[PDB]
Design a protein around this ligand. Structure first.
Ligand SMILES: NC(=O)c1cccnc1
Ligand code: NA
Ligand code: NA
Lengths: 275, 99, 8
């Protein structure tokens, strides 16, 4: 612990060309474990993690049928939102749904989440209480009123608090040999000269999970300003990478230290350029 | 509501000349999801290029990883070329072994 | 496993 399971369902309309594209991607923490793709020759939910491959034909048949029902559900939703916004039948639009549940170190139910987007923007979201809804616009108010009558929050709450948590614990057991690992960052400071200044670049490689913090310090104080930083990128082997650079005066490299924060580290790392 | 793809081109492992590696092209922060990614060696398209399944961020923007096998040399040029609706011309990002 | 979507 702590661990979470997240599903990402997306449907994109393609008027004229054919039917909308429907994709599902499932994650246990930062590891993808399932995928569904309507554009595949024989569309079915498939494993994306070799520890998921153990799951039998009854599991895959059940998840394929669930995926195919959602695909049709979002095909109707796309046509419904077209009437809410009074949009034309010739345009491409997207619906995104992301939902999940977080478990603790125990692991018992911590947090649950469920929300939608239309054309890249918030549409409707389930509140932290898993009981009430937050509509983002006047169209989302129509959906909220309909779902309040149908008791949609109660149906989803049961899943998020119970069904979601028991399946995440099963996948955590199936994939324990790798899912329960914390690969600590492999760090090094590179030096690059320039107006008589030097670029110091603190690297963090081979870490898992993705959540990391890289900071530069000068005499106990963090250099928030004039600090370049890249987005955490996947190495493609299950680990992540990140770097943070600073521009310091030539020959003063020993005064700057890079501080690394990762759950895989008992204490934060401290490193500098090594001549 | 269009968002331009942001690109990072980088090796899986610290690069060494004449040691085979994997070249990544990490494309993020785009909308709509439809995208075309090319990987190039010395100006010509790389035939075998693996793509990950597209997911999206908490900010709803999509992301995807394209990867191919490569053998870095001092002289060879590596790039990632991305075509997306939000751009009138493809965006190309060249591989820089220090980033 | 995931959940069944309720129509918007
Ligand atoms: N990981 C997998 O099971 C898998 C199957 C088919 C293609 N790519 C990955
Ligand atoms: Na959307
Ligand atoms: Na890769």
């Amino acid at each position: 612990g702590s661990h979470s399971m997240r599903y990402f369902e997306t449907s994109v309309s393609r008027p004229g060309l054919g039917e909308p594209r429907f994709i599902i991607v499932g994650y246990v923490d930062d590891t993808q474990f399932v995928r569904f793709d309507s554009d595949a020759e024989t569309p079915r939910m498939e494993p994306r993690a070799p520890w998921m491959e153990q799951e039998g034909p009854e599991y895959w048949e059940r998840e394929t049928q669930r995926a195919k029902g959602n695909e049709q559900s979002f095909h109707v939703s796309l046509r419904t939102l077209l009437g809410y916004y009074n949009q034309s039948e010739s345009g491409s639009h997207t619906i995104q749904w992301m939902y999940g549940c977080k478990v603790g170190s125990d692991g018992r139910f911590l947090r649950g989440y469920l929300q939608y987007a239309y054309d890249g923007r918030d549409y409707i979201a389930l509140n932290e209480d898993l009981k009430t809804w937050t509509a983002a616009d006047v169209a989302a108010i129509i959906t909220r009123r309909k779902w309040e009558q149908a008791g949609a929050a109660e149906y989803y709450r049961a899943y998020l608090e119970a069904e979601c948590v028991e399946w995440l614990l099963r996948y955590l057991e199936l994939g324990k040999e790798t899912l329960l690992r914390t690969d600590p960052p492999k760090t090094h400071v590179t030096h690059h000269p320039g107006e008589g200044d030097v670029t110091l670049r603190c690297w963090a490689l081979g870490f898992y999970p993705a959540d990391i913090t890289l900071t530069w310090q000068l005499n106990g104080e963090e250099l928030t300003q004039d600090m370049e930083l890249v987005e955490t990128r996947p190495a493609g082997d299950g680990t992540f990478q990140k770097w943070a650079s600073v521009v310091v005066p030539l020959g003063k490299e020993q005064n700057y230290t890079c501080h690394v924060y990762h759950e895989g580290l008992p204490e934060p790392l401290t490193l500098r350029w090594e001549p | 509501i269009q968002k331009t793809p942001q690109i990072q081109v980088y090796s899986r492992h610290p690069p060494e000349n004449g040691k085979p590696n994997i070249l990544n092209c990490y494309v993020t922060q785009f909308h709509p999801p439809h995208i075309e990614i090319q990987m190039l060696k010395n100006g010509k398209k790389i035939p075998k290029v693996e793509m990950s399944d597209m997911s999206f961020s908490k900010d709803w923007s999509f992301y995807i990883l394209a990867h191919t096998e490569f053998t870095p040399t001092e002289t060879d040029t590596y790039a990632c070329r991305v075509k997306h609706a939000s751009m009138a011309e493809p965006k190309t990002v060249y591989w820089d072994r220090d980033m | 496993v995931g959940i069944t979507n309720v129509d918007l």
